[PDB]
Symmetry: D2
Subunit: 105 residues, 4 copies
């Protein structure tokens, strides 16, 4: 009914973590930094990006710490009970068949 | 260094909450629902600043369909028990955009 | 690279739908977007495939729509070269009629 | 009223063309190739501070991210016939990021 779109150009924070489901489909997790400048100063936003499927395979193979990457996906907030029993929330950028990723540079 | 862009089309969840900061500028909070076809619904925490904050408080109501262009910002806060909490908000200020649709 | 156009605007007239030899549908509209600082930009939108049938069937003059696509500058011919930059909305794009409960 | 937004990532085709004008406004012109191998050529025009930055930092072959708005301008050719040129305008509402 609506539109849920995120566009990021940033730098991969760590070694991408790739995983596989029983069926063989790939899931790759990264953090992606984007930052702003300032004077009279730097604010960095750390985004949790999850790729699915083909893009997960490309991401897991070619991305490295410091990779500059374009990502188009959608926002998803996952709900989970912490070990102390209270609700927590995690907002991720989901990059699947409806999204896009381009390796830059 | 880099691009941080969110584009939403969705429906306001409730009447906007407008407040003001010591320096007088306006801050308006809303929740925005976006849904995809079975049906799944994402709830977004949207925060308007400055001029778009006044407009949003002025014209948005619990039903309104709205276009929002902003940036993601995960802010950290502390709960009742001194435990860390994080909330990722879509921040809409001079570099963003909001359009009431209809 | 990346080639992405995002429009919210009003359908300028009733869609034109045609069919290509292989039978696939192509629907042309014009989409008005404007800003006040007064100026209206008239976008040439071309839908392909499933969205073309949907667009021709359900969009009308004055419909408010969201469109996501890519820029394509098309060459045609007077004998002199002409060019039209179109927003191409096929399987990689998105179209949503706005409004609703 | 509506929304008019274009997001491109591509390579600058030629060396940017920058000119300054009386009011302090600068204008930079480039062509930008995106390919998906079919290549699409985009006319991109920067205004203001981004035109200054584009002229300083972009060169032929630079990879760049560009966010702007579509603008079609009308002109009469030297044969007297109407022609149209669609450009991506990158001004204060837009954005540019040199990549690589």
């Amino acid at each position: 009914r609506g539109v849920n779109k995120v566009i990021l150009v940033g730098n991969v924070g760590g070694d991408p973590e790739t995983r596989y489901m029983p069926n063989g489909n790939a899931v790759t997790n990264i953090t992606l930094a984007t930052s702003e400048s300032w004077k009279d100063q730097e604010r960095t936003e750390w985004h949790r990006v999850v790729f699915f499927g083909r893009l997960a395979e490309i991401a897991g193979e070619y991305l490295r710490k410091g990779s500059q990457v374009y990502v188009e996906g959608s926002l998803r907030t996952r709900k989970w009970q912490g070990q102390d029993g209270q609700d927590r929330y995690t907002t991720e950028i989901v990059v699947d068949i409806n999204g896009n990723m381009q390796l830059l540079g």
